[PDB]
């Protein structure tokens, strides 16, 4: 054949390994697996197929217990990756993108939401098209302004409600992974497959205003408002299209 199959060095293959995981989390849109299958066979002694990667993500973020190594393998009590860390997080860096991801710890602390069982559709309602950052009552959005006045944090409490970014350069913080997003569209969130789709329980949008690259940055999302039902009673969460200008 013409195609010389590449043999990846430990560092090169390790970057491609993380590159594949980041695509499965849906944080990235492209992946390079050339030579990744060989790298696993020599360094890991197993085939890094889609099934293998699914268990690594599922174990690292949810079901895994005990010490973990740089390749997301766990141990409950010469060759590489036999030093199992216990720091609680791994820096998943593919070289083209990177995200700091915190290891699962079972029911200890904030959990995740199963969007296969959960699917919250919020009925539309007329509402103000523009919302001032200084007076956000929405139940999905909480805003904090700091004394410097050139930093804004928007805490999203309903990850199920899409937030679309336009002309923004942002840093996302969550109990699952931390990363930066520089592309327009719906905020990307880590999706972990475990007998269904799981996403962060909450995430924080950090907007740095001390630089010029966030000029004209604007958020478009649904403002969830708990209004009372004219009929029957109780509370039926509604929503309305709104825009929050930051820049």
């Amino acid at each position, epitope marked *: 054949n013409l195609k010389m199959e590449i043999i990846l*060095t430990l560092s090169q293959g390790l970057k491609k390994y993380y590159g594949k995981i980041l695509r499965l989390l849906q944080l990235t849109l492209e992946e390079d697996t050339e030579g990744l299958l060989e790298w696993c066979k020599r360094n890991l002694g197993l085939d890094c197929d889609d099934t293998f990667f699914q268990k690594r993500i599922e174990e690292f973020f949810i079901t895994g217990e005990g010490h973990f190594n740089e390749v997301l393998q766990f141990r409950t009590p010469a060759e590489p990756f036999k030093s199992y860390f216990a720091k609680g997080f791994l820096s998943i860096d593919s070289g083209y993108y990177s995200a700091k991801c915190y290891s699962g710890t079972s029911n200890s602390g904030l959990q995740l939401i199963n969007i296969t069982r959960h699917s919250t559709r919020i009925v539309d309602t007329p509402g103000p098209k523009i919302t001032n950052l200084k007076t956000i009552n929405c139940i999905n959005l909480k805003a904090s302004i700091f004394k410097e006045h050139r930093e804004v944090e928007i805490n999203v409490l309903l990850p199920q409600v899409a937030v679309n970014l336009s002309n923004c350069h942002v840093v996302i913080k969550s109990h699952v992974c931390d990363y930066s997003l520089d592309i327009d569209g719906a905020v990307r969130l880590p999706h972990i497959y475990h007998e269904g789709v799981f996403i962060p329980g909450t995430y924080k949008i950090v907007i740095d205003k001390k630089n010029k690259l966030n000029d004209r940055c604007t958020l478009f999302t649904d403002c969830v408002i708990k209004g009372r039902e004219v009929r029957k009673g109780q509370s039926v969460l509604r929503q309305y299209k709104t825009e929050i200008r930051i820049g």
Partner: antibody
Amino acid sequence: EVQLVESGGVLVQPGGSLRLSCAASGFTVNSNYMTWVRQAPGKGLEWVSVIYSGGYTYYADSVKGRFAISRDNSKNTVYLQMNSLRVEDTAVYYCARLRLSSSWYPEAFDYWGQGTLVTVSS
Amino acid sequence: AILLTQSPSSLSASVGDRVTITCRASQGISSALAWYQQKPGRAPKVLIYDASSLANGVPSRFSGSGSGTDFTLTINSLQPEDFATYYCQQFNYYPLTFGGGTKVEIK
């Protein structure tokens, strides 16, 4: 001292089958990668195949369809087996151990065996 | 396959000469070239295991230098014990392959 001894090479009829072997000593073949290389008389070396510690294998493009490399932990032996020989299969065959750097990159063959000759003609 | 090629095909050299041989690949391999002695009716033997890094037990007369895809092997002094033929390898890609090697001629 670690030594590799190849044996069992013979003349065989073209299209026949043959069972090369390579016994190790001073180490266990399953611990580290074993390779095969061969030379057509008067020509240079060529590579044939490799078997990883995980028992996975890879083969040269000319031979991927025809040769099987195998090993047995208890016989401390690697085997190379021919499904059907071509005339260009005549060569001396050497077994060799493949040594990784500590970064687990393959760097060089060492402890080459004394070689074994196989031939294919009327 | 990755085309590995080497020059000169035969090298005139005499006892105590300092001399060099060249090995090259058709593509940008960067490291993991290996070089072997070969002698008539014998197994080859490694001399160089990665580019410049001399293998253990090799005579210090040999050294390697370059940047992968272009590489050379050099002899500080042609000891007649090393009249042989020298072969080079690459490990940057599968399939593994060897050049045609180089002769040395006593001249």
